[PDB]
């Protein structure tokens, strides 16, 4: 029935405007309320605002109300979120959603919004950092561990395989941590028999699409 689909950029610079779009379908867009919800990398879910499909009127989060503008477009059956003067704090996954409400009986008042359908959400990162490829450094010493250090790159993500993907057993690629410099950094390790060391070859394949850089690094003793 109802199907949502968020759209928008991946990168926004601080102080600029964040614009994401949501396409609804499989229902009368004018007969329901639609809005935006977001979740920050570690912080919880945060409702931004919801509006009526017909009038475009609605309600915003008081904490974001001054910077928020949720518009509608009946043609595309589409709503848009214009968040002005963003900072790193506005880095989040942005979901589109339908806002149902109920009579808070017996009064002629209404409940607030609960959400029966969400979109997959679009990720958006706010940063002034420039595009930069990672530096790859090897991590070396019956069982033995080894890996690669992929650091000082922007933006997310980097991909890391071992022996062109032919080595996956015991592999662990850690989530990227945002260093104080605005650049990201992670490590990828893999457990291997210490007996095969010195003979077996281990190469981590680091690929950073948003900056072309494709690096193969052989991890030795």
């Amino acid at each position: 029935q109802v199907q949502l689909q968020e759209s928008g950029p991946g990168l926004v610079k601080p102080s600029e405007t964040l614009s994401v779009t949501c396409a609804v379908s499989g229902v009368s867009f004018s007969s329901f309320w639609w809005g935006w919800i977001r979740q920050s990398p570690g912080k919880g879910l945060e409702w931004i605002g919801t509006i009526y499909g017909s009038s475009g009127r609605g309600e915003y989060n008081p904490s974001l109300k001054s910077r928020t503008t949720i518009s509608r477009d009946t043609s595309k059956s589409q709503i848009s979120l214009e968040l002005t003067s963003v900072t790193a704090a506005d880095t989040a996954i942005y979901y589109c959603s339908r806002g149902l409400f109920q009579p808070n009986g017996f009064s002629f008042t209404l409940t607030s919004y609960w959400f029966d359908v969400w979109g997959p959400g679009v990720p958006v990162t706010v940063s002034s950092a420039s595009t930069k490829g990672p530096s790859v450094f090897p991590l070396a010493p019956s069982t033995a561990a080894l890996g690669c250090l992929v650091k000082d790159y922007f933006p997310e993500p980097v991909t890391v395989s071992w022996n062109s993907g032919s080595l996956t057993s015991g592999v662990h690629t850690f989530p990227a941590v945002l260093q104080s410099s605005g650049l990201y950094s992670l490590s990828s390790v893999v457990t291997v028999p210490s007996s095969s060391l010195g003979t077996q070859t281990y190469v981590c394949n680091v690929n950073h699409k948003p900056s072309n850089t494709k690096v193969d690094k052989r991890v030795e003793i």
């Binding site: 007969s31 009526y52 017909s54 009127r57 609605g58 309600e59 409400f101 209404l110």
Partner: peptide, 11 residues
């Protein structure tokens, strides 16, 4: 008008 829209939606 907001509350008015709200109730119009439900009917």
């Amino acid at each position: 008008l907001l509350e008015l829209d709200k109730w119009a939606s439900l009917w």
